[model samples]
Target chain A: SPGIWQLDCTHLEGKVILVAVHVASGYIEAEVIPAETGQETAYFLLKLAGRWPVKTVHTDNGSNFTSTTVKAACWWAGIKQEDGGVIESMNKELKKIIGQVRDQAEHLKTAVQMAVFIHNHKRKGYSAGERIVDIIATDI
Target chain B: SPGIWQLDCTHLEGKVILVAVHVASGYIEAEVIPAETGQETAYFLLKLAGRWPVKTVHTDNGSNFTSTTVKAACWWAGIKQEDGGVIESMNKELKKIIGQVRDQAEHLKTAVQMAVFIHNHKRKGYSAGERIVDIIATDI
Candidate 1:
């Protein structure tokens, strides 16, 4: 709970894609959205809740994240909300991948998924001998 | 000096543009760039220094802001660097404008500049009776 992950959205070929990443474990989750709105953000949060125990959520002061619906959903789920600092860095990395495959939205989505997969598996000083996936798996 | 501004960069048609904004006053400055690099960031900072006395700059932990050259430039200028929370919201708004005119990069740049100008002139409770330009003018 101390290390809150960040949530943000980026564009691919004029499409909206939501991304959530854990700060400590480096685990990631993403989805393509029809539009960037509180409804989509709430849906993503609900899906994330199904996958893991969301103790908290960190995000920017974007309206989509701070909307009444999102705030209510977080309250119902008992998850603390705070400002996210690391999310912009994650978005930048995602944008780099998106820039390369700007012509193909499907390829961009696949590329993003693969990038997240590689990011979780990449060796890091904090990850010790296990990958991010393993660390997150143990926590759940 | 007390009203710290946030700095960030966004892309349009593969071109990078740097933006700086004051949350309290809504003052903004932006410039188009060929790339997102430390040198480009430093150049933008230097230009900003000439226009305004930047006491503090809040930005994400992106490489462009965290590079050794950028850190050195900030140190030389006596500008404190910290995490940016509001900058992302500004970027999101700018992105919306960029998305609307994605096919015309030149138009996108002009649109962004006009948008920033309009934002500065917009009324805000925090700005009291004066516009952002008036507040910024008094400071300078």
Candidate 2:
């Protein structure tokens, strides 16, 4: 299952590398290789298709998105690619989360896994003057 | 110059591994063996001493800390292990910072490096209140 795309800076070199994760299931499926051109985009996409059933791919209208490989991926996978502030906004939120541990202690991967699971499941976001949980629960 | 310790997690399986980080220089170190007894504490200290010039080993008064191995590590290192509320409190904070990604992503070598570097350099702390941009600033 494909979810929101995020930039995983946990392993970046010089440039910011973006990652795509299944938002609901918390899976890491695709990573954009760093380069001036989107050459690695195709490689990432091809590998991603082999692993998961990608239906809709969302990203900004960067040149990487316009690359031939990406376009081809969309055509082949029947993925509808669209641009919006959702993913970008999520990146900001994640950055803040990562920032909390700057220059403190080395938190283990398992420690972080437990942290993120609790965050998505427990933390309530504000939406329309109500908690997101409350809002979404009422609708359901 | 040696920076931080890179402990092996080879033997540690299906247990919560703790990674302690230096609060000031952002130097990191780890000890990742299955934490069954307090005797493993000496191993962590030995790992830290082999890597860096650890002046003060900070930790909480958990069972592992109170164990004889941990006390011996502190005595051998001539380092003062400080125990305070902050040590335990930071676990949640560290978890919060790392929880954004899945366990698989965190295990990636690249991902771990990125997280360590960014946490040490780009993140601001209460004492520094800003990321240490000067130490890592470079022209790409």
Candidate 3:
């Protein structure tokens, strides 16, 4: 099952990590964002739209979230933006992972990926990968 | 349960997809390489070394493969270079994916990731995620 999307961006050293979660399915997607831009934010939403039934995105009042750039993109996609309460818990876990491994992990991308995988597979008899594929397969 | 690393690079439109699979564990890692350089290749092996039992990498004699850069990096990591028979089949599947959806997909990174996820979860009772975590948890 699909749910509303919760979006959040957190910083690690010099990199910016953009994370989104589908509430109903506990499926999350994350990437190290290149930079802040109208185009990049819009493109991220576009990418999500292609993969899931993204009708609304809930995000905090972060500058990027509140910016007109996000507004226009939401309008363009026929979506409304609120905020990500689910993102707080995910980011907390993400922060703990990064903080714990800060000394050992010179690379964040792989570490972040590992964390995502572990989180997705935490439950029995379900897989985030399969869930995403089944939902998004109709699109492409 | 680590095996020798087989390294290969394939192309898709404007991007270079670098794929590596551990022979024994059937664990695979693929990422879109940024650009070719001595530094990048070494870093990739370094990343692998951090995460797996990367003792040797077998690859075709592509320019980057034969580059002294790769040689030195392999030496630095205390790993040898051999080749990847498994990578051939993986890349064949990768090629089919890119070729099949070249029109439908506007972004390659997410698509590549989905492909990797699907491939890793193909087995009946194992997950690439848990396997990698079990092996690499010692490093970080």
Candidate 4:
């Protein structure tokens, strides 16, 4: 399943970052947005549209997930909708790492990207103690 | 483990809802917010802060979870942070049910709350044929 992350921007006043996570493989993608909307959420999903054949998407009961446009887009794409709680947990950890660094908008975005890069590359044991990245690659 | 649901508004733009779930027990709590922020996320945690005595919070790599403010708050409350994937599955289910209904904001919120209520109240068997709710109440 895929998960959504709701991020906060301190220096940017009212802006927020939306993050999408591949729960099983631990892959992640994020973007800065004015607010969390179905349109913006769909845009984020589109970024990964070709990278993986998404079977299902899990998110909170937010407009971003409940909107007709988003729903239709998901339906058209043949992606099922679901809820996400595990990704919310990952969001908390990401914020902790990013919170330690206070930088500009662009720099912050880079930092988030780097954080995810490290998270994906970081070798972690899965079933039978295999690397998560390797498992993800096999699925692909 | 506990689950967190980060909701965004559709009918009422700029509004968001935060929901927390006890994965094993199926207990849940929700609230409305103007935006999705670390501060708001912390506030939601505070509401469950007392009842759960959280040992660890699992979420995605969102700024709301990464912020210093939310981190300090969780630390002050003696809550540890971990990554989550299970909640994403729950989030997927929430959107699917909520999506089926085309209702107003108030009605939608009520519907979600009721759904959760029924989810918690419905008696279901777990290990050794024990009721899940009964197991959860024992933890409380």
Clashes of each: 0, 4, 7, 35
Q: Point out where model 3 deviates above 4 Å.
A: A1-140, B1-3, B34-37, B75-78, B83-85, B99-104, B124-140
Worst 10 residues of 4 chain A by lDDT: A2-11
Q: What is the interface RMSD of candidate 1, in Å?
A: 23.1
lDDT (CA) per prediction: 0.59, 0.41, 0.62, 0.50
What 10-residue stretch in candidate 1 chain A is worst by lDDT?
Answer: A126-135
The candidates' DockQ values read 0.01, 0.02, 0.06, 0.02
**lDDT digits (tens) for residues B1-140 of candidate 4:** 32232322222334565666655554555555676678667655543543333566765456756788668657655667655544566666556655554252234454454344334434454321123323332343
Best by DockQ: 3
- Lowest summed-lDDT stretch of 10 residues in model 3 chain B? B131-140
Share of reference contacts kept by candidate 3: 0.00
Q: Which candidate number maximizes lDDT?
A: 3
- Tens-place lDDT per residue, model 1, B1-140, is 42476787777767887887765655677767777788667656644543344678887457856688778657645578777646667778767755664543235454554445344434555322133334443443
What's model 4's lDDT at A54?
A: 59
lDDT of 4 by residue, A1-140 (tens): 22222222222335676766555555555655777777666545543432334567776556656788668656644567665455556777777656654452135554454444445444454321123223433433
Q: Which candidate wins on TM-score? A: 3
- Evaluated on chain B only, candidate 2 has a TM-score of 0.53
> Candidate 3: RMSD over Cα atoms?
9.2
CA error at residue B114 for candidate 4, angstroms: 38
Give lDDT tens digits, candidate 2, residues B13-107.
25544555555434343333455455555555544442234556555346655777667656755556655344344444444434443352425
- Name the regions of candidate 1 deviating beyond 4 angstroms: A1-140, B1-3, B98-107, B124-140
Candidate 4 i-RMS (Å)?
Answer: 19.6
Model 1, docking class? incorrect
Off by over 4 Å in 4: A1-13, A100-106, A125-133, B1-140
